[PDB]
Structures are given as structure tokens and as C-alpha cells.
Design a protein around this ligand. Sequence first.
Ligand SMILES: N[C@@H]1[C@@H](O)[C@H](O)[C@@H](CO)O[C@H]1O
Length: 242
Amino acid sequence: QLTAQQRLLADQIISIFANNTPELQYGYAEVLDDGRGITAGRAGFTSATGDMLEVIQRYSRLRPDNILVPFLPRLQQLAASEDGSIEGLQGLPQRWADASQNPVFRQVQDDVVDELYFQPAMERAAELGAQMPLTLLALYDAIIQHGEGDDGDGLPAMIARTTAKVNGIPAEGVDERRWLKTFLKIRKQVLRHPANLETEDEWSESTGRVDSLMKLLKQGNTDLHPPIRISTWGDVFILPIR
Ligand SMILES: N[C@@H]1[C@@H](O)[C@H](O)[C@@H](CO)O[C@H]1O
């Protein structure tokens, strides 16, 4: 669905949306007061969302004695009830940072990103008949930030509301740039008025990323050809970095 050089490019873009840098932040770990507990890694795995659990479980299977195995029974509890409780979990950000020095841990992160986020976004893009590279990037960024759940703010609901507005999908003859514009605008409205109020501040400050995607659409760079200019937070970046 995406080129190797398009996927490197999309990862560097999405890293700028999330951490203002094109270098993937495997070692990132913060509490953000968004109702999600601790947020970590390249795709922002979360204590509350069952994200951070799948990574550490898989890692513990590859390496049964790692510095993060003691956090595991607390993590199962949070994932169980989607709990944003920062505590139960002291020291974990530092150990997530340290585990990130291991290429194997970083790889588990890649594997979950592909299993939870990239592949499903690509499957959703193919059911849409979507086939501009920019649309794929926007679906992928969106699935990372909003998730693939059943809420009104998840990617499936936004896709459904985009398809309702333009009476159809690109595989059905609706112009794809029109479907994409609508989706980008519906996304910005969800970020600025999320149904889950705990993520309001964290999401309403993130909408510059939707503008950067919108900017590429209006500039006709729907195929993600280089060079790509991203300046989401004020800092300018010419992708791909080399
Ligand atoms: N709000 C986001 C959720 O959207 C996501 O789980 C994560 C990764 O981007 O980080 C947060 O900031």
C-alpha cells in the first residue's frame, strides 16, 4: 500500500506530530493528564488503553526476566477497566526508557505498531478504495491518535461519518480528495471537541497536525513526493531526513 520510502516518510511526519522530531521516540515515557495514565513509545502506548500491556507482555515472552515484568499484574488491571491510574506503576517510565536501549524492545514496538495501527489503517484504506498516499498517511496518523475502538472518536466512527457526509466512498465513485477533505475536517472537530472530555486539552492542542495534512492536500502533494516540509510546531523540517 505504501512504498518503503513513503513509509519512512510517514513515520517521520507522525513522529513530528507527536514529539516535534522525525527520530522515533522509542524511549519516551510521560504522564500527560489525558485520562490514559502513562504514555510511551513511538506510537504512544498507554497504561489505560491496553497498548503498553501488549508491548511488555510480548517483550516478556521474548525475555522472561526484564526490568518491566514487575509492572505486569498492575498493567493487566488497568487494561482490564481502562484505568488512567498513574500509580501502582512507580519507576516504569525510567525502565521503559532503559528497556528502549535494546533493539529487541524497539522491535516489539514496531511489531505492535504494525499489528494494531498500520495494517488496520491500510485495510480500512482498501475497503474505502482509498489509494492516494496522503489519504493512507491521514488514516494511519488518525488510527494512532484516535485508536481503532467503537467510540464516536475512534477511526471507524470518523470514517463512517466522512462517508455519510459525501454520500459514499472512493471505491464507489466519490472523488477521493473530497472524501479526504471531509475526513480531515471531521477529525479536527473531534480533536477540538472530543466525546471523552479527559482528552480535551491534550487533543485540542494537537490539531496543527491535521492542518499539516490539510496543507499537503491543498498543495496537491497527495502522493507524498519529496521534499516534504513539515512545520507543525514552529520548527521546520525537510523530509525525508538523510
Ligand atoms: N492523545 C494521544 C492518544 O491519542 C494516543 O494514544 C497517544 C499517541 O499519539 O498519545 C496521546 O497523546
